[PDB]
């Protein structure tokens, strides 16, 4: 608080220095028939390469990437690992059988009998070019380009290989195929970080009470403030409440009076972060709780105020001495003496007549800068004038309160 006040001596009273919050813990997280592409019984010739458009599914791309079912695995644009985190409009796959040495030709920027007359790729990116050895299950029943057949003999560069080329459609239409959403288990009664399939916020997840209907994923109560959400993968309804947070203030009798300080947390259950005590206003730590009552010294809230006998104390403030005037309808109390007294009452009637130069305040001694200020018109003039209009009436207040005497009387000697 010395810091947030920028002083080495902070005075008596209550000061706010920062906020606090419960940090989120243990975050939680809320199929395309590729078998007929890579595990197909038969593939066609390269000159008549076939293609199928794969769409409308959630596709897990690690199955054919992290295991060695292929001899060639080369992807472009996106590293092969991250395909499971991306959505695409469409996926196309080309399939054919070729010779081994001819595998290097299935790429952009290639030349040869295959690249030029059998299967040509555009000068662009390609999802993944994947190939595997196939002489174990296939090997003159394949043709290449006018056309020629392949002498695939079972007895490496001349062996048959099955090639699948994946091509993705990007942002042409709403995405129809993406990878999986590797959800995790959920927790309860704890502030957590959540990611509810497109919703990333914080709070405490508990079993909800309000009933949804079959076509609601989540709900709100006012201004997009999500209250409860049905989990799409487990089909349960849970409520959201923010994890307790708030302001923290300190109570001091003064820096040169005593370094003893108590900390006040506002609006929380003091189950969690010397002395510990609860109030209607938040729990106090370091202030000893007394029973009897006194005049409010350092206010806290909800009727509780807070040094006495070299320690801090909190108490409910007394309103005043409780006396009961004895009412009688046959008797009256009257003064039989009097005490004349004096009383000081302080009232401000002025402030310092502030005046600020806008063109110097914003730019000052710069012609080029002020050239841009002119594009904001009269802002300075209205602001300059507004300040002039207060400084003018400050002289009036002093004139109005004090100058009420027709002339200047003198005290007789």
């Amino acid at each position: 608080t010395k810091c947030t006040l920028k002083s080495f001596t902070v005075e008596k009273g209550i000061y706010q220095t920062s906020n606090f919050r419960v940090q989120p813990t243990e975050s939680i997280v809320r199929l395309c028939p590729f078998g007929e592409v890579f595990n197909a019984t038969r593939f066609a010739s390269v000159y008549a390469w076939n293609r199928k458009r794969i769409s409308n599914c959630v596709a897990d791309y690690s199955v054919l990437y992290n295991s060695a079912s292929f001899s060639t695995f080369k992807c472009y644009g996106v590293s092969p690992t991250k395909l499971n985190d991306l959505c695409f409009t469409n996926v196309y796959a080309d399939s054919f059988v070729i010779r081994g040495d001819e595998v290097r030709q299935i790429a952009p920027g290639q030349t040869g009998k295959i690249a030029d007359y059998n299967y040509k790729l555009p000068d662009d990116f390609t999802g993944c070019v994947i190939a595997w050895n196939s002489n174990n299950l296939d090997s003159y029943n394949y043709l290449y380009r006018p056309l020629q057949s392949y002498g695939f003999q079972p007895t490496v560069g001349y062996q048959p290989y099955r090639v699948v080329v994946l091509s993705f459609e990007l942002l042409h239409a709403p995405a129809t195929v993406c990878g999986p959403k590797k959800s995790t288990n959920l927790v309860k009664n704890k502030c957590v970080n959540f990611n509810f399939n497109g919703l990333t916020g914080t709070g405490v997840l508990t079993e909800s009470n309000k009933k949804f209907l079959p076509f609601q994923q989540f709900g709100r109560d006012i201004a997009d403030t999500t209250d409860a959400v049905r989990d799409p993968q487990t089909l349960e309804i849970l409520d959201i409440t923010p994890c307790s947070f708030g302001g923290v203030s300190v109570i001091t009798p003064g820096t040169n009076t005593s370094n003893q300080v108590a900390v006040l947390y506002q609006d929380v259950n003091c189950t969690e972060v010397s002395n510990v005590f609860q109030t209607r206003a938040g729990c106090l730590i370091g202030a000893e709780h007394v029973n009897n009552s006194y005049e409010c010294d350092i206010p806290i809230g909800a009727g509780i105020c807070a040094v006495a006998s070299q320690s801090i104390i909190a108490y409910t403030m007394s309103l005043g001495a409780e006396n009961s005037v004895a009412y009688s309808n046959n008797s009256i109390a009257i003064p039989t003496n009097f005490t004349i007294s004096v009383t000081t009452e302080i009232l401000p009637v002025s402030m310092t007549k502030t005046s600020v130069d806008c063109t110097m305040y914003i730019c000052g001694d710069s012609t080029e800068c002020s050239n841009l200020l002119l594009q904001y018109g009269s802002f300075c003039t209205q602001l300059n004038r507004a300040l002039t209009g207060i400084a003018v009436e400050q002289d009036k207040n002093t004139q109005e309160v004090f100058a009420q005497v027709k002339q200047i009387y003198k005290t007789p000697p």
Binding site: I340, S341, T343, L372, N397, V401
Partner: protein, 238 residues
């Protein structure tokens, strides 16, 4: 304070000049009481003026004369307490000190904002301009201007709101002086506690301090009463 396009205007009425009004004021209310604030001043002996002011509350004039010595003693020993209450107790003028602190804080916050970046490459206008061609420089400058303008707009808005609050305070202070200094207030609990008798303004740098002299009962006894008394079949009301 005021060091880069900021200033403070001097007051029209200086401290030595205001202290002449308050000397003129309470040199009247000693010599003439409520009269001088209506028309021509009328010199009235002080004790006579006080005796009337007692009558203005509801205590018979003679009470003051019979106890004139005691009243003067209590009055003086009361004024001396103010001299000493103020001379040692800090935060005596906290209400007055607050306005000064608020003004100072507003000025210091505004000045500090000159070092804010506002998303620019640099917080200082001289450096951005000194190393960027006008095209790119104006873009970086425009961010700075918008920020600084918003900071100034914030200042002037709060200053007007604070000014409005002072105006109400000034109106009250002016009002209190007219009825409590240039006259004798009848409304209760307005010019200090108790039954209002007299008051005097005292100067202050940014405000006005009043010393309110009031009559307060004490040392009271129990008596039996009767709405009226009956004598020869008639009710005698006081």
């Amino acid at each position: 304070q005021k060091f880069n396009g900021l200033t403070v205007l001097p007051p029209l009425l200086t401290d030595e000049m205001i202290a002449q009004y308050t000397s003129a004021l309470l040199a009247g209310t000693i010599t003439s009481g409520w009269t001088f604030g209506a028309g021509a001043a009328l010199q009235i002996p002080f004790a006579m003026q006080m005796a009337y002011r007692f009558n203005g509350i509801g205590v018979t004039q003679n009470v003051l004369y019979e106890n004139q010595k005691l009243i003067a003693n209590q009055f003086n020993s009361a004024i001396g307490k103010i001299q000493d209450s103020l001379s040692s107790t800090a935060s005596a003028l906290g209400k007055l000190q607050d306005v000064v602190n608020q003004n100072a804080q507003a000025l210091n916050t505004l000045v500090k904002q000159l070092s804010s970046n506002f998303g620019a490459i640099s917080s200082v206008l001289n450096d951005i301009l000194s190393r960027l061609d006008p095209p790119e420089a104006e873009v970086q400058i425009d961010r700075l201007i918008t920020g600084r303008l918003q900071s100034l707009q914030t200042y002037v808005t709060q200053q007007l709101i604070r000014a409005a609050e002072i105006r109400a305070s000034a109106n009250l202070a002016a009002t209190k002086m007219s009825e409590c200094v240039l006259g004798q207030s009848k409304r209760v609990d307005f010019c200090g506690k108790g039954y209002h008798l007299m008051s005097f303004p005292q100067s202050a740098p940014h405000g006005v301090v009043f010393l309110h002299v009031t009559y307060v009962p004490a040392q009271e006894k129990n008596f039996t009463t009767a709405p009226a008394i009956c004598h020869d079949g008639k009710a005698h009301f006081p």
